[PDB]
Write a protein that binds this ligand. Structure first.
Ligand SMILES: c1ccc(-c2cc3cc(-c4cn[nH]c4)cnc3[nH]2)cc1
Length: 288
């Protein structure tokens, strides 16, 4: 048909975000997975002070576009408390850079790992509930803007001041207004992917929820690797398709495990929505 919902992520880069590279000074390397580095940015404030930011870059081609992808998606979504904030981008004379909010504690996965012994500036059950709650809200927001993240995991969740969680790395994110599915034609997070994504290459709101389930398992297991000791081979894919699922992690309240189980239903339609998840966790928090 000749009649289309316009996808904002496919529109041209809006130079409202453009930022002079002269006004950036690169610090330490912050991650590699491209790479992000800490920097100070002049002129982002009305009073014209310097502020600390995180800049996402590439090394000297599909990752070239994945960065442009991530940028247009962030630009499209706008600002939310539970998403890494886009602050600007450099696209002129030089390599493409993406400036975003700096999260002082880094990824949630290594945070839970550092804090694993201190558990029970320590960690306790109420923090993990909060992380549950915030991440589901950030996800419910993406779903509200017809966006699927497609790489939901503890490694892609940053923790900032105030124990606030932010979703980051939108390289694989898509906007699914026109079609109810998304079919892909790269390297992928198998142990976080829904079956229909592995077997038929389809991605939907329901497949993000599946990833959210695996994330909870990461979360209540204090940063343990999914399907521990299980290599990604033929043995793995069968067990998935036959219906086998991880068991409850050590510190997961029974009703939080019930949420993982419904996120892992082979039937996408029997999975809950992020809207429903946010309601569930909110009631669990109240009863305390
Ligand atoms: C210690 C070590 C590392 C960090 C840290 C990582 C990180 C990553 C992003 C990021 C932006 N886009 N994608 C990812 C932002 N801030 C960060 N901060 C903080 C304390």
């Amino acid at each position: 048909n000749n009649y289309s919902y316009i996808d904002p992520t496919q529109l041209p880069y809006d130079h409202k975000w453009e930022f002079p590279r002269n006004r950036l000074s690169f610090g330490k390397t912050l991650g590699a997975g491209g790479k992000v580095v800490e920097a100070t940015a002049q002129g982002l404030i009305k009073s014209d002070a310097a502020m600390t930011v995180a800049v996402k870059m590439l090394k000297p081609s599909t990752e070239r576009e994945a960065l442009m992808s991530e940028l247009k998606v962030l630009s499209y979504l706008g600002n939310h408390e539970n998403i890494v904030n886009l602050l600007g981008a450099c696209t002129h004379g030089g390599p493409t850079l993406v400036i975003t909010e700096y999260c002082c504690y880094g990824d949630l996965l290594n945070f839970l790992r550092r804090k694993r012994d201190s558990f029970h500036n320590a960690l306790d059950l109420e923090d993990l509930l909060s992380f549950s709650y915030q991440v589901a809200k950030g996800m419910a927001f993406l779903a509200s803007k017809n966006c699927i993240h497609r790489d939901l995991a503890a490694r892609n969740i940053l923790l900032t001041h105030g124990r606030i969680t932010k979703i980051c790395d939108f390289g694989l994110a898509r906007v699914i207004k026109n079609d109810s599915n998304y079919v892909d034609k790269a390297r992928l997070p198998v142990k976080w992917m829904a079956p229909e994504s592995i077997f038929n290459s389809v991605y939907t709101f329901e497949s993000d929820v599946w990833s959210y389930g695996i994330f909870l398992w990461e979360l209540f297991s204090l940063g343990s690797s999914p399907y521990p000791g299980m290599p990604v081979d033929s043995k793995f894919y069968k067990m998935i398709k036959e219906g086998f699922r991880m068991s409850s992690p050590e510190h997961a309240p029974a009703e939080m495990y019930d949420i993982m189980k419904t996120c892992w239903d082979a039937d996408p339609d029997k999975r809950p929505t992020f809207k429903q998840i946010v309601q569930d966790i909110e009631k669990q928090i109240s009863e305390s």
